[PDB]
C-alpha cells in the first residue's frame, strides 16, 4: 500500500521541508507504489508525556522506523531514551542522529539504535594516530569517573596496546569534584607533558584553573582535548595551546534529514523479495506478537551503503554508527579557533598557519624529562646487603 | 501502604483474595499495609503508563511489586523507565521482570530477585567436581553479554589442586543449517557441554543437536537461561514459595526497607505519588544507599548497590523420564546438599558411550 | 651496595635507598575477587611505581 515512516523532530518548522523531501520519492528505485508520508509530531516538552503521544500516534499510523533529533534545549539525554524503550518493545528498527553518547551503543537495553553521528567514544581513536605523526610515545590521561569516562578509556588502552603497550598513569575523579588538586600533585611527576582530558562540559573550568595555579600550562607542555571541553563555558579560562577537536557536519539537522530518507527509501525497495513481507502490527490498543521480519529489517539497514549525501560514505559498523567522519582538527591561537588541518579517517595535515604550542613556543615541545633521582629497593641478605 | 499490580487472566479472579490474607502476615510498628489488586491485562503500555500514576495519585502508595505469567522479559526496561524518574522503589517477585538487566540507570531503585549469569555460573562447577566431571566444553552463540560468560570460566580451573581441561566453540548460527551445525559441532574435546542462549533461540539448536544425535543419556547439557534426556538448569528456586509467600515476601522487604530511613528521623515520602502534578524531578537522594541488609525468615536477601541480589538461594533442576523438571541439588550459603545419593559413576545422570569399553 | 655506588658514578645519576615494605621477594598470587592476579613484595613495587 503506502510506506509511511515515523519521525520526531524538535520544531514544527523543521518538519516543513521533511514532507517535501519524502515527496520526491518518484525519482528513486522502483517507484511502483511507494507513497512516503511524514507521520511526524513535534517532541513533547517533557519526556514523561512524550510516550503518551507515540503509542496512539506513531504506532497507530503503521510506521516502520523513527528518526529522533536532539532537542533545542541542552537536555541531559532525556529525549532519546523513551523512543528506544517504546520502539524496542515492538522490536521496530529505529535510527537517530545528534546522539553523541556511549550509552546508546550497547544492545543490553537499547537493542535497536542506529545513530548516523559518531560518538564521543570513537573520538579517542583519532588521538592514537594524531600523536603518531607528531612523534609522541608516553602519555598520561585525566579521565572523569563515570559511564562516559570509562567508555573511552577501555578503547584507548586497546588501541595503544599494540603500539606503545600501556599508557603511563590513568587518573580518575568523581564527576562533581570541587577544589581537588590532590591528583594533580603527581601530574608533574611522570615526565609526560601530554596531558589528555575527557572531562564534562563544566569540569574543564575546574581543571584548567587548577593547572593554572601550578603553572602546568607553561612552556614545554602539550594538551589533547575532546570536543566537550571546547564548546560552551569550557572555552573560557583555557590553555593557550590546546589541540582540541570539533565536528563538521554536526549541529546541522537538515544534513542528515535527506541522508536518512535516502537510506530508508533504498532499504524499502530491497525488502521486496519472495520471503515474508508482513507489516508491523497496527495500533497499540492490543498487541503482543512481534512481526518476524522486524529484526530482518534492521539487518537490511545494516547492509545499506548509501553513496550519496555526505561524500557518499553512509556506512555502519557492526553497531549503528557513522563511519569516516571528519573532525577538522582545531586549535587555540590567542583566543581564536584557528584550524590547522583536517582528518578524514587517515590523518594528513594541510598545515594552514603555524602551530603555537602552550607557552608561545614556536617549535613543538617533546614531552619527556628523564629524572636523575631514583628510588632503589633492597632486602636483607647476609653476604650481599647487611643491615 | 504497599501497592500490588497483577497482569494476566490467570491471576484476574485470584488477585482479590490475597489482600486481607497478607495484611496480617507481616506486622511492623509505624507502618500500614493496604494491598490492591489490578485486573488489567495487555502487553501494550497503555494501562502500564496511565493506571499506575492514577493509583499513585489515588492512594499515595509507596512500593510496587509486579508479576507476570509469560516469560518475556521485554517489560523490565519500561519499569526501569518509570523507576528512575518517579524515585519509587520497585521490587519484582517473578515473571517477566525476573531476568537481570544491567547496567541499571543512575538514580533508579529497581530491585529484582535473581542472580546474574556469573553468580549462576559458579554454582555449576561444584556439581562438576562432586560427580567427578572435570572435562567440559563451553559452547554458546551471539548474546548481548556472552563475553563475560567466557571470562569467569577459567578463573576457577586456573587455580585449584586438581588439573582441569578446557575446550569450546565461539558462536553458532541456527540459520546456517542443522546438518552444517552438526559437522561444526564435531569440534569437541569432552563429554559435557555448557549451554547459554536465548529461550526462543534454544529450540532450533536442540533439533540440530537431535540431528547431531548427542541428545541421549550419553551426553549432558547445562542450561543457564525436543528436550534431550538428562538436562540440567538453574532457576534460583523460582518454582518454590508457592504464590502466597511470594507476595508476602515482596511486601516484607519494602516494609523492612521503608524502616531503614524512618529510624533516623521521621520522613514521609510522597515524591513518587505524582507523575503529572509537578514539573521538577531534581529532588532525590540516597535512592540505593539503604536496602543493604534485608533479612527475613532465617535468610539473607542482601542487595548490591547496583541493584541485584547477592545472597540468593540457588538450586539445580534436572529432568525426569516423563519430561518434567525436578530439583535434585541445592545451594544454601555454601553448603551444597546433594539429594539422589551420588554413588559409583556412569550410572546416575550420565552413561558411557558404549558398555564394552566400561570394565571394573 | 658496593656495586650500586660504582654504577652511580659511571652513569651519573643519584640514588635514595629504602628497604622493602614487607620483606618478601616476589611471586604472583590471586586476588579474592575473580583471578585478577598481581605481584607482591620487592617484585611488585617496581611495577607499581
From Swiss-Prot, chain A:
Belongs to the glutamate-gated ion channel (TC 1.A.10.1) family. NR1/GRIN1 subfamily. It is found in: Cell membrane; Postsynaptic cell membrane; Postsynaptic density membrane; Synaptic cell membrane. A hydrophobic region that gives rise to the prediction of a transmembrane span does not cross the membrane, but is part of a discontinuously helical region that dips into the membrane and is probably part of the pore and of the selectivity filter. The extracellular N-terminal domain (NTD) is a site of allosteric regulation to modulate overall receptor function. Residues 1-387 are extracellular. It is linked to Neurodevelopmental disorder with or without hyperkinetic movements and seizures, autosomal dominant: An autosomal dominant neurodevelopmental disorder characterized by severe intellectual disability and developmental delay, absent speech, muscular hypotonia, dyskinesia, and hyperkinetic movements. Cortical blindness, cerebral atrophy, and seizures are present in some patients. Neurodevelopmental disorder with or without hyperkinetic movements and seizures, autosomal recessive: An autosomal recessive neurodevelopmental disorder characterized by severe intellectual disability and psychomotor developmental delay, involuntary and stereotypic movements, spasticity, and inability to walk without support. Intractable seizures manifest in some patients. Disulfide bonds join 55-284. NMDA is probably regulated by C-terminal phosphorylation of an isoform of GRIN1 by PKC. Its phosphorylated state is influenced by the formation of the NMDAR-PPP2CB complex and the NMDAR channel activity. It comes from Homo sapiens (Human). This is Glutamate receptor ionotropic, NMDA 1. Glycans are attached at residues 37, 179, 215, 252, 276, 326, 344.
From Swiss-Prot, chain B:
Residues 1-360 are extracellular. Coiled coil: none annotated. Belongs to the glutamate-gated ion channel (TC 1.A.10.1) family. NR2D/GRIN2D subfamily. It is linked to Developmental and epileptic encephalopathy 46: A form of epileptic encephalopathy, a heterogeneous group of severe early-onset epilepsies characterized by refractory seizures, neurodevelopmental impairment, and poor prognosis. Development is normal prior to seizure onset, after which cognitive and motor delays become apparent. Disulfide bonds join 53-275. It comes from Homo sapiens. A hydrophobic region that gives rise to the prediction of a transmembrane span does not cross the membrane, but is part of a discontinuously helical region that dips into the membrane and is probably part of the pore and of the selectivity filter. Component of N-methyl-D-aspartate (NMDA) receptors (NMDARs) that function as heterotetrameric, ligand-gated cation channels with high calcium permeability and voltage-dependent block by Mg(2+). Participates in synaptic plasticity for learning and memory formation. Channel activation requires binding of the neurotransmitter L-glutamate to the GluN2 subunit, glycine or D-serine binding to the GluN1 subunit, plus membrane depolarization to eliminate channel inhibition by Mg(2+). NMDARs mediate simultaneously the potasium efflux and the influx of calcium and sodium. The chain holds residues 52 to 433 of 1336 of the full protein. It comes from the Eukaryota. Heterotetramer. Forms heterotetrameric channels composed of two GluN1/zeta subunits (GRIN1), and two identical GluN2/epsilon subunits (GRIN2A, GRIN2B, GRIN2C or GRIN2D) or GluN3 subunits (GRIN3A or GRIN3B) (in vitro). In vivo, the subunit composition may depend on the expression levels of the different subunits. Interacts with PDZ domains of PATJ and DLG4. Glycans are attached at residues 41, 279, 293, 311.
UniProtKB/Swiss-Prot annotation, chain C:
NMDA is probably regulated by C-terminal phosphorylation of an isoform of GRIN1 by PKC. Its phosphorylated state is influenced by the formation of the NMDAR-PPP2CB complex and the NMDAR channel activity. It comes from the Eukaryota. Glycans are attached at residues 12, 32. It is found in: Cell membrane; Postsynaptic cell membrane; Postsynaptic density membrane; Synaptic cell membrane. Component of N-methyl-D-aspartate (NMDA) receptors (NMDARs) that function as heterotetrameric, ligand-gated cation channels with high calcium permeability and voltage-dependent block by Mg(2+). NMDARs participate in synaptic plasticity for learning and memory formation by contributing to the long-term potentiation (LTP). Channel activation requires binding of the neurotransmitter L-glutamate to the GluN2 subunit, glycine or D-serine binding to the GluN1 subunit, plus membrane depolarization to eliminate channel inhibition by Mg(2+). Belongs to the glutamate-gated ion channel (TC 1.A.10.1) family. NR1/GRIN1 subfamily. A hydrophobic region that gives rise to the prediction of a transmembrane span does not cross the membrane, but is part of a discontinuously helical region that dips into the membrane and is probably part of the pore and of the selectivity filter. This is Glutamate receptor ionotropic, NMDA 1. It comes from Homo sapiens. The lineage of its organism: Eukaryota, Metazoa, Chordata, Craniata, Vertebrata. The chain holds residues 460 to 508 of 938 of the full protein.
Amino acid at each position: 500500500k503506502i510506506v509511511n515512516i515515523g519521525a520526531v523532530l524538535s520544531t514544527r518548522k523543521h518538519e516543513q521541508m521533511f514532507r517535501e523531501a519524502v515527496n520526491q520519492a518518484n525519482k528513486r528505485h522502483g517507484s511502483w507504489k511507494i507513497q512516503l508520508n511524514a507521520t511526524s509530531v513535534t517532541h513533547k516538552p517533557n519526556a514523561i508525556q512524550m510516550a503518551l503521544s507515540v503509542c496512539e500516534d506513531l504506532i497507530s499510523s503503521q510506521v516502520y522506523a523513527i528518526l529522533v533529533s536532539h532537542p533545542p534545549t541542552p537536555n541531559d539525554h532525556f529525549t532519546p531514551t523513551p523512543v528506544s524503550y517504546t520502539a524496542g518493545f515492538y522490536r521496530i528498527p529505529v535510527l537517530g542522529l545528534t546522539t553523541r553518547m556511549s550509552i546508546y551503543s550497547d544492545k543490553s537495553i537499547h537493542l535497536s539504535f542506529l545513530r548516523t553521528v559518531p560518538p564521543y567514544s570513537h573520538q579517542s581513536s583519532v588521538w592514537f594516530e594524531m600523536m603518531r605523526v607528531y612523534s609522541w610515545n608516553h602519555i598520561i590521561l585525566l579521565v572523569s569517573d563515570d559511564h562516559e569516562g570509562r567508555a573511552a578509556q577501555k578503547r584507548l588502552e586497546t588501541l595503544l596496546e599494540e603500539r606503545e603497550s600501556k599508557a603511563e598513569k590513568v587518573l580518575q575523579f568523581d564527576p562533581g569534584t570541587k577544589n581537588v588538586t590532590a591528583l594533580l600533585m603527581e601530574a608533574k611527576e611522570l615526565e609526560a607533558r601530554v596531558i589528555i582530558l575527557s572531562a564534562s562540559e563544566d569540569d574543564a573550568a575546574t581543571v584548567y584553573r587548577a593547572a593554572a595555579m601550578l603553572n602546568m600550562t607553561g612552556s614545554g607542555y602539550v594538551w589533547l582535548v575532546g570536543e566537550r571541553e571546547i564548546s560552551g563555558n569550557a572555552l573560557r579560562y583555557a590553555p593557550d595551546g590546546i589541540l582540541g577537536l570539533q565536528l563538521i557536519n554536526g549541529k546541522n539537522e537538515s544534513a542528515h534529514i535527506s541522508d536518512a530518507v535516502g537510506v530508508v527509501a533504498q532499504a524499502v525497495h530491497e525488502l521486496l523479495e519472495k520471503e515474508n513481507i508482513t507489516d508491523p502490527p497496527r495500533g497499540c490498543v492490543g498487541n503482543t506478537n512481534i512481526w518476524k521480519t522486524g529484526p530482518l529489517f534492521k539487518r537490511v539497514l545494516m547492509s545499506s551503503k548509501y553513496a550519496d549525501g555526505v561524500t557518499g560514505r553512509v556506512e555502519f559498523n557492526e553497531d549503528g554508527d557513522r563511519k569516516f567522519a571528519n573532525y577538522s582538527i582545531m586549535n587555540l591561537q590567542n583566543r581564536k579557533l584557528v584550524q590547522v588541518g583536517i582528518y578524514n579517517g587517515t590523518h594528513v595535515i594541510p598545515n594552514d598557519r603555524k602551530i603555537i604550542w602552550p607557552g608561545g613556543e614556536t617549535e613543538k615541545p617533546r614531552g619527556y624529562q628523564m629524572s636523575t633521582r631514583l628510588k632503589i629497593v633492597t632486602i636483607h641478605q647476609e653476604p650481599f646487603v647487611y643491615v | 501502604n504497599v501497592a500490588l499490580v497483577f497482569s494476566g487472566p490467570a491471576y484476574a479472579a485470584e488477585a482479590a483474595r490475597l489482600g486481607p490474607a497478607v495484611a496480617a502476615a507481616v506486622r511492623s510498628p509505624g507502618l500500614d499495609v493496604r494491598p490492591v489488586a489490578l485486573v488489567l491485562n495487555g502487553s501494550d503500555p497503555r494501562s502500564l503508563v496511565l493506571q499506575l500514576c492514577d493509583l499513585l495519585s489515588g492512594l499515595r502508595v509507596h512500593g510496587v511489586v509486579f508479576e507476570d505469567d509469560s516469560r518475556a522479559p521485554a517489560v523490565a526496561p519500561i519499569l526501569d523507565f518509570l523507576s528512575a524518574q518517579t524515585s519509587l522503589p520497585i521490587v519484582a517477585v517473578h515473571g517477566g521482570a525476573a531476568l537481570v538487566l544491567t547496567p541499571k540507570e543512575k538514580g533508579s531503585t529497581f530491585l529484582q530477585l535473581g542472580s546474574s549469569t556469573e553468580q549462576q555460573l559458579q554454582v555449576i562447577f561444584e556439581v562438576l567436581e562432586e560427580y567427578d566431571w572435570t572435562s567440559f566444553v563451553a559452547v554458546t552463540t551471539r548474546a548481548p553479554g556472552h563475553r563475560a560468560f567466557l571470562s569467569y570460566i577459567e578463573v576457577l580451573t586456573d587455580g585449584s589442586l586438581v588439573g582441569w581441561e578446557h575446550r569450546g566453540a565461539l558462536t553458532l548460527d541456527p540459520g546456517a543449517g542443522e546438518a552444517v551445525l552438526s559437522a561444526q559441532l564435531r569440534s569437541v574435546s569432552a563429554q559435557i557441554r555448557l549451554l547459554f542462549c536465548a529461550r526462543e533461540e534454544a529450540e532450533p539448536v536442540f533439533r540440530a543437536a537431535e540431528e547431531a544425535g548427542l541428545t541421549g543419556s550419553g551426553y549432558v547439557w547445562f542450561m543457564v537461561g525436543p528436550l534431550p534426556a538428562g538436562l540440567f538448569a538453574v532457576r534460583s528456586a523460582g518454582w518454590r514459595d508457592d504464590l502466597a509467600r511470594r507476595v508476602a515476601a515482596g511486601v516484607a522487604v519494602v516494609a523492612r526497607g521503608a524502616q531503614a530511613l524512618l529510624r533516623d528521623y521521621g520522613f514521609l515520602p510522597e515524591l513518587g505519588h505524582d507523575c503529572r502534578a509537578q514539573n521538577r524531578t531534581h529532588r532525590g537522594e540516597s535512592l540505593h544507599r539503604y536496602f543493604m541488609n534485608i533479612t527475613w525468615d532465617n535468610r539473607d536477601y542482601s542487595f548490591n548497590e547496583d541493584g541485584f541480589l547477592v545472597n540468593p538461594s540457588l538450586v539445580v533442576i534436572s529432568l525426569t523420564r516423563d519430561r518434567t523438571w525436578e530439583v535434585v541439588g541445592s545451594w544454601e550459603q555454601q553448603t551444597l546438599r546433594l539429594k539422589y545419593p551420588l554413588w559409583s559413576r556412569y550410572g546416575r545422570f550420565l552413561q558411557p558411550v558404549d558398555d564394552t569399553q566400561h570394565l571394573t | 651496595i658496593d656495586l650500586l655506588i660504582k654504577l652511580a658514578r659511571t652513569m651519573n645519576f643519584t640514588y635514595e635507598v629504602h628497604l622493602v615494605a614487607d620483606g618478601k621477594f616476589g611471586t604472583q598470587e590471586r586476588v579474592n575477587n575473580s583471578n585478577k592476579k598481581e605481584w607482591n613484595g620487592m617484585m611488585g613495587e617496581l611495577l607499581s611505581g
